[PDB]
Amino acid sequence: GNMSFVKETVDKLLKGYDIRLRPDFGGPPVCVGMNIDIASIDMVSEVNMDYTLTMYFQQYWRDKRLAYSGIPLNLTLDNRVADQLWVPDTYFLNDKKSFVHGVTVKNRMIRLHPDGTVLYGLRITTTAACMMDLRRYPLDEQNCTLEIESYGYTTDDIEFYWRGGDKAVTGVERIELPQFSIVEHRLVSRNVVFATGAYPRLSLSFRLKRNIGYFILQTYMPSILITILSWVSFWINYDASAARVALGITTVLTMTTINTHLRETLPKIPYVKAIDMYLMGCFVFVFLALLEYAFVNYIFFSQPARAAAIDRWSRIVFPFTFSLFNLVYWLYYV
Amino acid sequence: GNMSFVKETVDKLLKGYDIRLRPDFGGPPVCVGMNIDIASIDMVSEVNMDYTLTMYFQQYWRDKRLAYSGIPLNLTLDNRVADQLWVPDTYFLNDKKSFVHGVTVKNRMIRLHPDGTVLYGLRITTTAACMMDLRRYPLDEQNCTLEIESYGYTTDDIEFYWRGGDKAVTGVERIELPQFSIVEHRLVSRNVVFATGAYPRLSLSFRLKRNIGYFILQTYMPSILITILSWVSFWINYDASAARVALGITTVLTMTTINTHLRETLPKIPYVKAIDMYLMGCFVFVFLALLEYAFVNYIFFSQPARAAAIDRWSRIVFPFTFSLFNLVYWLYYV
Amino acid sequence: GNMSFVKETVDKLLKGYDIRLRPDFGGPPVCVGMNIDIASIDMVSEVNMDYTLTMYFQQYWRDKRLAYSGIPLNLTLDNRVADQLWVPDTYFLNDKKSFVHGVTVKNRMIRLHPDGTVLYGLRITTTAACMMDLRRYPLDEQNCTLEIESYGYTTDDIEFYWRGGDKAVTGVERIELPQFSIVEHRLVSRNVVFATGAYPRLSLSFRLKRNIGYFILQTYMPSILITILSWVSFWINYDASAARVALGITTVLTMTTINTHLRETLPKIPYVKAIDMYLMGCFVFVFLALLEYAFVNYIFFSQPARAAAIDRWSRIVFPFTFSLFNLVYWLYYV
Amino acid sequence: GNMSFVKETVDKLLKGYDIRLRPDFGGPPVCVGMNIDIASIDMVSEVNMDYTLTMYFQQYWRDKRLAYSGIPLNLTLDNRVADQLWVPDTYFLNDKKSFVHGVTVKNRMIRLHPDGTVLYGLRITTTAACMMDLRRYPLDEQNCTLEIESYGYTTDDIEFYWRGGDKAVTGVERIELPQFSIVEHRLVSRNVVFATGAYPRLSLSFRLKRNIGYFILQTYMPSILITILSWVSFWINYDASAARVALGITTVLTMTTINTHLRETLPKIPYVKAIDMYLMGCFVFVFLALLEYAFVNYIFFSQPARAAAIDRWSRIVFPFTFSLFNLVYWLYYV
Amino acid sequence: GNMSFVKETVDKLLKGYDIRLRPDFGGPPVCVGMNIDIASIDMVSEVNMDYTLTMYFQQYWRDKRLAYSGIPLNLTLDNRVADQLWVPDTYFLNDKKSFVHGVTVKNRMIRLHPDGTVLYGLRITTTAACMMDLRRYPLDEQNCTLEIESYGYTTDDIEFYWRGGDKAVTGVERIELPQFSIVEHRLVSRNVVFATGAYPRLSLSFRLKRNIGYFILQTYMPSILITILSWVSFWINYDASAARVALGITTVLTMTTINTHLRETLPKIPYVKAIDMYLMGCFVFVFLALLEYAFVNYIFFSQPARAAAIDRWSRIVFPFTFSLFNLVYWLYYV
Numbered sequence A, B, C, D, E: 001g002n003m004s005f006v007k008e009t010v011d012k013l014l015k016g017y018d019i020r021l022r023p024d025f026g027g028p029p030v031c032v033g034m035n036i037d038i039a040s041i042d043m044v045s046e047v048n049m050d051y052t053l054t055m056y057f058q059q060y061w062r063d064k065r066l067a068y069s070g071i072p073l074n075l076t077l078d079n080r081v082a083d084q085l086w087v088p089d090t091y092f093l094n095d096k097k098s099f100v101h102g103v104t105v106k107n108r109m110i111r112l113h114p115d116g117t118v119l120y121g122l123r124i125t126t127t128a129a130c131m132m133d134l135r136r137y138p139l140d141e142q143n144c145t146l147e148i149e150s151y152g153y154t155t156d157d158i159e160f161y162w163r164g165g166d167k168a169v170t171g172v173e174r175i176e177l178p179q180f181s182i183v184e185h186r187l188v189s190r191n192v193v194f195a196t197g198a199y200p201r202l203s204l205s206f207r208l209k210r211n212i213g214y215f216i217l218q219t220y221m222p223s224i225l226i227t228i229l230s231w232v233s234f235w236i237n238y239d240a241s242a243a244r245v246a247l248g249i250t251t252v253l254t255m256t257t258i259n260t261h262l263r264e265t266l267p268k269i270p271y272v273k274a275i276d277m278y279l280m281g282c283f284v285f286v287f288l289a290l291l292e293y294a295f296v297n298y299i300f301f302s303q304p305a306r307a308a309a310i311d312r313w314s315r316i317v318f319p320f321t322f323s324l325f326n327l328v329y330w331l332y333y334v
């Protein structure tokens, strides 16, 4: 309760305190416990292969140089005192753009304990790279990880562990991804050996399952219906050259128009995906449907009996082949 | 009026003043009163699920260490003196990108009072996350909130309240949102219990009702008219194969062209919305209209009497079914 | 000419100088004169409702504490000395993103005078919010203002005025806006009363008239010509079912294609504009033109004499109605 | 070779050195020589009317206060010593976003000479505004300039000149612009009189000639071919109503589709360009081609002899008028 | 193990240490060894002609002033001590936007050795300019280089070499480029002579081979199929004017629609590419196919025998010419 007495204690601790030396320098490595309180996942971008994450990053360790006695209450110092202490050189291995919020003040917390324990919390919005195998898009399951490592110190100087076991990372249930749904998150602690030596490593991975309801209604359904309309020409009198030619080519034109516009809406990733195969697969059927009439029209004059046979056979072969195409497609990717 | 006397008083207050210790450290929590003067809401983005807000954020508390006597006038110190005082660690829970304007100087105000009262104002442009339930888009009502909390101190160390009751937040009437209209704003004061303890919480929520006039004229009206034109083929002589086939497929082509282009203009949110159901609902009718002629054309030769019956029945069934589709659609989402 | 003597004078002025106290603290308010030398207006964005402005912002006031004698020449100190003086807390009320250029050095000027007069110039590129009433777009006239106010001090502590009267703001004639043309700029000085008290206010407003030549050629002209082509079907033999049906629906398809693509090129503002009414107005005529043939075709067999009467009457009613539509449109918005 | 002796010399020079006073304060103006080593021109944006430039900006002047004796070798001090010296307040008049690279260290060089000469180099990536007269786009020649001026000091206090004459600016030959080709660069030294007095001015201008090969193949060629296909209807039997009507309107539809999509690819500049006139010029011919058939079809029944005369005359008038249109277009803009 | 003894040693080394003087000032140049541990290549943008690179940049040199004795263990000081030492002025010649990550702390490592050796590591995300010769796009092979040079010091003052020979740069095998595949990387050490003198240079170049699977399926395949459908009109009865005219023009319309939409998806680079020639090459065949029918239709009445000869000859000439076009195209660019 005595502010002057507390002020003297803090100045005494900081007097002779060297920030360039880790706790227990030259001795056993300092154990650091880390908890993450995830606030939200802002976006998951397939074009940039990254996801934006906002979280409360806390580090828990003990520094004997900061131990104080006589004050039972835990000291909650101002965030500006963190520049005068020693903090682990924790950094994220796969981040691309990370920053600490500073409104109204820097979102930073320093809390001291009588036994020298230090609690250090940060609110960080980081963009972590996540390579995606989008061959089975949009029926794919992604695994995006956040890697935590010490930049300068080795395992002999510092050790990382998840404070709380599997309960170290919270707030996953509150994440609301419009496109994905979180299935499972895992916590991994391991040591990685590099050229300069072993380093502590902490990993936070998510397995994301993409929602398919939007793509079925917006992408797959229009393509199927246009393919169905291409079969209308089969149930048309062969003498109506204008009707079947116009119907066949317009369906090809309609298929191209939807296919080109979807690509612009879809991510700009330049490699073959599951949706691209299906759309080009349907484009073959409308291409074959128009070619079917050309063969019928050419031989209609010479062999009218055979021409009608091809027209009625196409009424079964095309729906049967298309169903087999869907059966192969919807089992290979599911 | 004596500048030298005032200068001595300020230096005396700052002498022995510790920024690392909150007012009444070790005693009752310091009560902080907060008022918000909203300037404008820059944008409300559905793609990023966030809204940009510009406001004058003011904090009101009392620090006995800064109390001075002999000068009746309230001291309006320079903004650069705020770095030498103690200010609450107020931060916004759901913000994404927030900053304080600094042109020409930092938009910051420090005002002192004889009884130790401190007034601290900031002009902050913050981007706050707002998860949106856009299933009923564009006929949806959104509720975006701004959450205020203390990062480090608990309820035992600091307490938050709205200075002025329901009058704490002003400027809502002056907000001009081109797309939304503000219906109601609420002020909520509560304490939230976390792992580290209870924290003060202040909430500022808005309920936004989206305007529909643009979407009715630009999106719903063109789709209805194209659907109406699909019924023109019913009032066409059945022998005109070229006329009805061309009309039917072009309406399907026209429906696809407008549908694909609207999606690019509409937000890239990948899930089913109210507008998507309506556009795909209308796309079924034009799909059925073309299929209706195919059935009529196939049986026209064998049963001309029955074929004409189907053509005239479609003149009533299709308009009646479409009206029922609108009746269900315009009551479910309204 | 004596550098050592000048160096001693500046140090003497800064000795005992308090930046936390305004000139004549506790006395009459300090009058500040402001001139603006506008360099260019970078952009005027309708989507974001803001305009980017680059200008030379200068402030002119007198501080007796900085008065010096013995040196007739005006002192032009380095820009880094501004951090050691007192400058007004001038800020822009409606700015969104503002910064001071710092290449190669900070674009800042401090000039001292023997009578204590201080000249303070800044080169600022600010993005100021400008709400636009785009109902009459693109035939609208916009009024974008830049508001200048003191953040902390009231009218009792500081007063604002335009140094030079109507000549305070220059460089308006040199502004080259590709889309707009500046018609008139006004300077307004007023005092605004808030909860904390009255504040000085300086306003710089522009009235922008949008150019219409681009929209007439690129948007209005194609729509008119397509509407004219819809009347071609009237001068077509009624027995040619394929010709008139194809012409009617393709014009509807052509009207939709241009209408959808223009919206993407046009700003994403979601409310009804003047151009939207005209494009949807023309879309009705092509919709009615196709409906006109359907009525003629249906009754052509039963009453060929009446069907020809409707076809020839449409050759006059449609051009006359369209001209009246333009006459109403081009007088309501002009 | 004696590091201690060199360290003493530098400290002696900085002792008593005032950064707020220019060299020869109160005397003749200090002459500054400037050389530019252009690295690359990143982009030339027509939408934003600016170009991004990366260069090595060096300033050359003499300060007698920094003169040292006894050390023949030129001193190459660390970049962090520039904050302790006096440097000209050089800034770019027409820049929009400029910065100095700071990886790994700040790209800044300070070099001292025994005679007091100071060399000051910076690596700056600046975005300079360049108003473009794009009426003749894409057959236009642009002139983008970089303006150099002193922010605070007048001609009486500082003078600018190009160190090396016409050889001051190098690296122009190494610039690789994908769209433009540099024709000529000029160096201009002049004094500009403002309200506060005369200022030194250095100008670096480029004259850029736009490449036309891409636009000829991608924009002009498709438009010409579609216009040619519109003349196919002339060599079609007049009795084929379906063939000529479909061909005429589809060419109009094809012309609209390419015209609308090009505008989105082309810059969003809202004023008439050379390409816009040509595309709308070709759109008239296809509009007239369809109108030509309407006149022929209407009078074909009454006067078949005259109708055939118009059809064969259109086979010559349209190609001749189109060639004259190109002859006027390709000479007015070339 | 004695923290106080280590603290005294570091302070002794920093006492009298001058950062403005390079090691062995006035003597032999200081040799700097550099290793790069590439983390990932974020993107390779053809529009901006740059690639984003994330790497661990380490510098290895010896400074005798920092040599210490008595402590066998290598000192791993805090990253904040780097501001108090001397580090090479290493910068990247062709970078555009480069920064050092600073979350949670600045990603910087300083390690000292008893023999005065200093290890200095940085984690840098740099955007390096890479001019691309995209004439053969998308069948092109690109060569993007990262250039390393000393900004201020010449070869007489500093020398650069790759520490580890060809093993200096690692992590290339772990790079996952979705569009490109890394073929070979080279390390080059050379001295470049400029106006101010020779400078050390280190180069890291990559040769990237673009994947073609996406472009074959998405771009080349649709164009070929539409060209094939243009040959359908050859196997159509010549009397069917409506069928062949509609098929010919719609294929031209279909070719234009896909061609225009691909350009928007493709990079905005304004010069002729390999893909542009192929798409315009195919557009000629559909243009010639429609022209072929016009010649046949015109002379069908006068010379029916000759008209049928042209129709059957087109069934061979067009497929043969198209195959030769592909044979020339697929050998010139491969």
Ligand SMILES: *[C@@H]1O[C@H](CO)[C@@H](O[C@@H]2O[C@H](CO)[C@@H](O[C@@H]3O[C@H](CO[C@H]4O[C@H](CO)[C@@H](O)[C@H](O)[C@@H]4O)[C@@H](O)[C@H](O[C@H]4O[C@H](CO)[C@@H](O)[C@H](O)[C@@H]4O)[C@@H]3O)[C@H](O)[C@H]2NC(C)=O)[C@H](O)[C@H]1NC(C)=O
Binding pocket: A143, A144, A145, A184, A185, A186, A188, A189, A190, A191, A203, A205, A206, A207
């Ligand atoms: C996304 O993809 C990443 C990989 O790219 C997955 O990460 C892997 O996760 C698994 C767990 O699901 C990890 O496997 C575990 O590794 C632990 C650490 O191993 C280190 O230490 C041991 C010695 O103790 C060494 O042998 C080893 O080489 C490492 O140095 C182990 O301790 C775990 O063992 C436990 O489980 C196994 C069964 O799995 C038991 O047999 C053991 O007895 C013990 O109980 C386990 O092996 C794996 O290391 C991770 N890989 C990487 C690269 O981090 C993510 O899981 C994935 N995302 C999701 C959501 O699954």
Ligand SMILES: *[C@@H]1O[C@H](CO)[C@@H](O[C@@H]2O[C@H](CO)[C@@H](O[C@@H]3O[C@H](CO[C@H]4O[C@H](CO)[C@@H](O)[C@H](O)[C@@H]4O)[C@@H](O)[C@H](O[C@H]4O[C@H](CO)[C@@H](O)[C@H](O)[C@@H]4O)[C@@H]3O)[C@H](O)[C@H]2NC(C)=O)[C@H](O)[C@H]1NC(C)=O
Binding pocket: B143, B144, B145, B184, B185, B186, B188, B189, B190, B191, B203, B205, B206, B207
């Ligand atoms: C957007 O959506 C958010 C929710 O996501 C809405 O926020 C809620 O707003 C309501 C008010 O409209 C809040 O309800 C009020 O909470 C107050 C605080 O409760 C705390 O303290 C009490 C004890 O005093 C505890 O029991 C409780 O658990 C909390 O810890 C209460 O004091 C209020 O009670 C008053 O009103 C009720 C009637 O509503 C009376 O019965 C009471 O006697 C008393 O007068 C009230 O319950 C709610 O807490 C808010 N939720 C959140 C999560 O903040 C926004 O309102 C919405 N936007 C709009 C525009 O509506």
Ligand SMILES: *[C@@H]1O[C@H](CO)[C@@H](O[C@@H]2O[C@H](CO)[C@@H](O[C@@H]3O[C@H](CO[C@H]4O[C@H](CO)[C@@H](O)[C@H](O)[C@@H]4O)[C@@H](O)[C@H](O[C@H]4O[C@H](CO)[C@@H](O)[C@H](O)[C@@H]4O)[C@@H]3O)[C@H](O)[C@H]2NC(C)=O)[C@H](O)[C@H]1NC(C)=O
Binding pocket: C143, C144, C145, C184, C185, C186, C188, C189, C190, C191, C203, C205, C206, C207
């Ligand atoms: C864009 O839109 C803005 C408004 O949103 C316009 O700004 C207005 O501009 C007009 C002038 O064109 C301003 O009117 C003038 O206000 C001055 C200040 O008034 C204050 O002080 C008086 C007492 O002196 C109080 O009564 C008053 O309430 C204010 O506190 C007056 O001094 C002016 O009076 C002079 O002109 C009038 C005639 O206009 C004479 O009758 C008087 O005798 C005297 O000569 C005048 O009234 C108005 O205040 C501005 N509004 C705002 C909100 O700033 C922009 O002009 C417009 N853009 C363009 C290009 O026009």
Ligand SMILES: *[C@@H]1O[C@H](CO)[C@@H](O[C@@H]2O[C@H](CO)[C@@H](O[C@@H]3O[C@H](CO[C@H]4O[C@H](CO)[C@@H](O)[C@H](O)[C@@H]4O)[C@@H](O)[C@H](O[C@H]4O[C@H](CO)[C@@H](O)[C@H](O)[C@@H]4O)[C@@H]3O)[C@H](O)[C@H]2NC(C)=O)[C@H](O)[C@H]1NC(C)=O
Binding pocket: D143, D144, D145, D184, D185, D186, D188, D189, D190, D191, D203, D205, D206, D207
């Ligand atoms: C892009 O567009 C800009 C203009 O917007 C062009 O810049 C102009 O460039 C020309 C040179 O090509 C400049 O003309 C030269 O100006 C020099 C400076 O003039 C100042 O000083 C004189 C007195 O010495 C004053 O009278 C004058 O008012 C100025 O204050 C002159 O010294 C030059 O004279 C020399 O050449 C002329 C012939 O051109 C001879 O007759 C003379 O004897 C002498 O040898 C000359 O007049 C012009 O000033 C520039 N304008 C601006 C605004 O900077 C760029 O050139 C253009 N880009 C390209 C690539 O051309």
Ligand SMILES: *[C@@H]1O[C@H](CO)[C@@H](O[C@@H]2O[C@H](CO)[C@@H](O[C@@H]3O[C@H](CO[C@H]4O[C@H](CO)[C@@H](O)[C@H](O)[C@@H]4O)[C@@H](O)[C@H](O[C@H]4O[C@H](CO)[C@@H](O)[C@H](O)[C@@H]4O)[C@@H]3O)[C@H](O)[C@H]2NC(C)=O)[C@H](O)[C@H]1NC(C)=O
Binding pocket: E143, E144, E145, E184, E185, E186, E188, E189, E190, E191, E203, E205, E206, E207
């Ligand atoms: C992307 O494109 C760049 C060029 O734009 C390529 O970079 C070139 O790479 C080659 C190697 O593949 C470099 O050639 C080598 O240069 C070394 C340095 O030369 C300097 O020093 C010598 C004297 O020692 C001077 O004569 C010379 O002028 C330079 O000042 C040489 O030491 C190398 O010689 C070795 O190899 C050759 C055979 O190649 C042997 O004959 C020699 O005996 C010796 O073993 C060699 O000549 C070239 O300098 C680079 N150019 C630039 C501008 O950097 C990239 O390689 C390319 N990307 C890929 C993936 O290939």
Ligand SMILES: *[C@@H]1O[C@H](CO)[C@@H](O)[C@H](O)[C@H]1NC(C)=O
Binding pocket: A002, A004, A005
């Ligand atoms: C606080 O401690 C100081 C120093 O021992 C002492 O003088 C003062 O009386 C104490 N105050 C209280 C309230 O204990």
Ligand SMILES: *[C@@H]1O[C@H](CO)[C@@H](O)[C@H](O)[C@H]1NC(C)=O
Binding pocket: B002, B004, B005
């Ligand atoms: C201001 O206070 C000082 C110190 O007491 C005194 O010397 C001076 O005369 C005072 N001036 C006025 C105007 O009261």
Ligand SMILES: *[C@@H]1O[C@H](CO)[C@@H](O)[C@H](O)[C@H]1NC(C)=O
Binding pocket: C002, C004, C005
């Ligand atoms: C400048 O002033 C100093 C201090 O009075 C004096 O010693 C010196 O001689 C003066 N120099 C000149 C040139 O007047």
Ligand SMILES: *[C@@H]1O[C@H](CO)[C@@H](O)[C@H](O)[C@H]1NC(C)=O
Binding pocket: D002, D004, D005
């Ligand atoms: C460097 O100069 C100092 C000071 O004069 C002297 O003591 C020392 O011996 C000199 N060293 C050399 C190598 O000249």
Ligand SMILES: *[C@@H]1O[C@H](CO)[C@@H](O)[C@H](O)[C@H]1NC(C)=O
Binding pocket: E002, E004, E005
């Ligand atoms: C560390 O060194 C100091 C200074 O010599 C000495 O007083 C102290 O006893 C030493 N401690 C240990 C553990 O060696």
